[PDB]
Design a protein around this ligand. Structure first.
Ligand SMILES: NC(=O)CC[C@H](NC(=O)c1cccc(Oc2ccccc2)c1)C(=O)O
Ligand SMILES: NC(=O)CC[C@H](NC(=O)c1cccc(Oc2ccccc2)c1)C(=O)O
Lengths: 169, 169
């Protein structure tokens, strides 16, 4: 079962008591400056990452703008504002402008998928893929094909108040 | 009376003979590595920038994704991949995903303006604003309000083949 890693979380994020949920707050928490902590970008990783095999989880997503989630390679940079892009080691979907995106670069890719409530993330480290599905009807949203070469962690980001992400059984 | 400054242009850009038009090509031109040149982001400035008063120009825009334009402060960073954001000195509209945006951060602002062919940029360095209008019917698209404190240059960016920007009388 995944849980969010509080040592990675940007200090403006609020992690739920059960460490499954994240939203953005107004307060910058006073937290230890661990190297694994995202000090500027509004990100948090799960506590455990994967090096091989197939793994899946589900993310409950808010209806309002401001979230992005998927996976990141461990070496994703933690300090400073870093780009949210595949080149920088993040493979994610995002909600911005009432629209859903795969965060490709330099052009984001529109999904045109309609409203999402819960998304299944399927990480395949044998093939080198990460895929996203809408849980309601399992329609395929997006797949990134990647030559993963290190440990890969579930990634969550919430850069606006009023939305959330939550890991769901 | 604006022209694009070839010394600023990313080497993958193609500037028109009259230095009014820009598109992205496949070839990295062999150009001098002037400090003013954008070496990675797909940007070019006009040759002249403004420190006071009101100035306007028009930009013909392609229908396909990949452009952004507006204004940039002179101090906009030219080297490396740098964020395309107000905090980094760029105030711009963008076409990305069949969607028009004002490039706010951390969330882009959708314009929901319908198809654009030509856009008037009105830079007001007395008030501290840059505004964008659709030329068809002069409807107001967006205004950034900024405490400008240095010379501000017209900015153009084309990060995908198949689209263009052109300065229009
Ligand atoms: N959630 C998403 O859609 C992914 C984008 C996300 N953006 C940022 O983190 C970002 C980008 C620019 C400024 C910025 O600064 C702030 C810091 C504290 C609170 C609010 C904004 C934060 C990320 O890269 O993970
Ligand atoms: N026009 C726009 O919508 C503005 C965004 C624009 N993006 C980039 O420049 C960018 C962003 C990431 C990678 C990248 O690399 C490339 C280099 C050569 C050709 C293609 C892409 C370029 C910018 O910041 O001006």
């Amino acid at each position: 079962e995944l849980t969010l890693d509080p040592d990675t979380a940007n200090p403006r994020l609020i992690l739920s008591l059960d460490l499954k949920g994240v939203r953005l707050g107004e307060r910058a928490q006073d937290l230890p400056n661990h190297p694994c902590r995202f000090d500027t970008n509004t990100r948090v990783l799960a506590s455990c990452g994967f090096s091989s095999g197939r793994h899946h989880w589900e993310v409950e997503v808010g209806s309002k703008d401001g979230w992005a989630f998927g996976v990141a390679r461990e070496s994703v940079r933690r300090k400073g504002l870093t780009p949210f892009t595949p080149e920088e080691g993040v493979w994610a979907l995002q909600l911005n402008g009432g629209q859903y995106w795969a965060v490709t670069s330099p052009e984001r890719s529109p999904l045109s998928c309609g409203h999402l409530s819960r998304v299944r993330v399927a990480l395949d480290l044998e093939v080198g893929a990460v895929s996203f599905y809408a849980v309601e009807d399992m329609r395929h949203l997006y797949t990134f094909r990647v030559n993963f070469q290190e440990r890969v962690f579930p990634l969550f980001s919430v850069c606006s108040t009023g939305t959330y992400l939550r890991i769901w059984p």
